């Protein structure tokens, strides 16, 4: 009661590097999806990699 | 039926023809690599060659090893395989 | 060793020992890496 | 299961004579190590070395600039998975019409 802990919107903190991991993941996903259409990989591989 | 008979039937009715199907390096490696297995070491010579040919410098060195111009390799890519008829 | 005195002559080491604002990597020490493989040379997965 | 990641930014230097060419499940080109290797990360100040001998799938090439927290190798979970093989049939659907 003396401390009065509370949770806020800004209090929720994300790991400094998230914009990098998600960005490289979606970049790799794009490169794959391009190549799939060219015949360099097959669907099972696409499914798995994703 | 037999494979030969089937191919004959196809040529006669459907119109099958074994075209050249010029491929990219990334694809040639895919066609010559999925025949062995997965995450397994490449033992076939053509598979190792296709794996090494994924680098531009390796190709530009192999084209000079045999003494061919830059346009000669591109012309040899679009080459008709199989038995060629007599003139 | 009477009156032993130890100090950092360079400013970077002094700021690192005291705690003043200083870069993490010493610009003196920093040495450029030799050129890595070009984007063209990389395998397709890593190409930009 | 366990993915070896890069400690810092720099160049990956390893001897390609001990590693044998392979193809990842995900379709990418790769290198398989059947023996212990020591990779070096030529960073601005320091270096770093890590690898697993029985099964290492190296997804990177020699003299390649990599950034931090990037997947470099896969331990491959060399410990055997439970052998409950289930075979499933996925169907490819044509996006456009034709012959």
UniProtKB/Swiss-Prot annotation, chain D:
Signal peptide interval: none
According to the lineage, what is the superkingdom?
Eukaryota
What's this protein's function?
DNA-dependent RNA polymerase catalyzes the transcription of DNA into RNA using the four ribonucleoside triphosphates as substrates.
Q: Where in the cell is it found?
A: Plastid, Chloroplast
> Gene of origin?
rpoC2
Q: How does it assemble?
A: In plastids the minimal PEP RNA polymerase catalytic core is composed of four subunits: alpha, beta, beta', and beta''. When a (nuclear-encoded) sigma factor is associated with the core the holoenzyme is formed, which can initiate transcription.
Q: What is this protein called?
A: DNA-directed RNA polymerase subunit beta''
Family to which the UniProt record says this protein belongs: Belongs to the RNA polymerase beta' chain family. RpoC2 subfamily.
């Amino acid at each position: 009661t003396a401390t009065s802990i509370s949770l806020g919107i800004d209090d929720l903190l994300t790991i400094p590097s998230k914009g990098w991991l998600v960005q490289d993941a979606e970049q790799q996903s794009l490169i794959l999806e391009k190549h799939h259409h060219y015949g360099n990989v097959h669907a099972v591989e696409k499914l798995r990699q994703s | 039926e037999s494979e030969e008979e089937a191919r004959r039937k196809n040529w006669v009715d459907r119109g099958w023809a074994p075209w050249e199907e010029i491929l990219s390096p990334e694809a040639n490696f895919a066609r010559k690599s999925l025949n062995e297995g997965e995450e397994v070491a490449l033992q076939s010579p053509e598979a190792i060659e296709a794996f090494k040919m994924l680098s531009p410098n390796y190709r530009k060195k192999k084209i000079s090893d045999m003494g061919i111009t830059e346009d000669e390799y591109y012309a040899k890519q679009f080459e008709i395989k199989g038995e060629i008829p007599e003139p | 060793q009477p009156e032993q005195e130890e100090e950092e002559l360079t400013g970077y080491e002094l700021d690192k020992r005291l705690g003043r604002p200083h870069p993490f990597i010493d610009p003196k020490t920093k040495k450029k890496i030799e050129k890595p493989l070009t984007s063209e040379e990389l395998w397709w997965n890593w190409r930009k | 299961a366990e993915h070896v990641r890069a400690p810092s930014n720099g160049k990956i230097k390893f001897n390609e004579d001990l590693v044998h060419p392979t193809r990842t499940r995900h379709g990418h080109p790769a290198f398989l190590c059947s023996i212990d290797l020591y990779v070096t990360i030529e960073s601005e100040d320091i270096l770093h070395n890590v690898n697993i001998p029985p099964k290492s799938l190296l997804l990177v090439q020699n003299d390649q600039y990599v950034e931090s927290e990037q997947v470099i190798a896969e331990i491959r979970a060399g410990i055997s998975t439970l052998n409950f093989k289930e075979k499933v049939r996925k169907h490819i659907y044509s996006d456009s019409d034709g012959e």
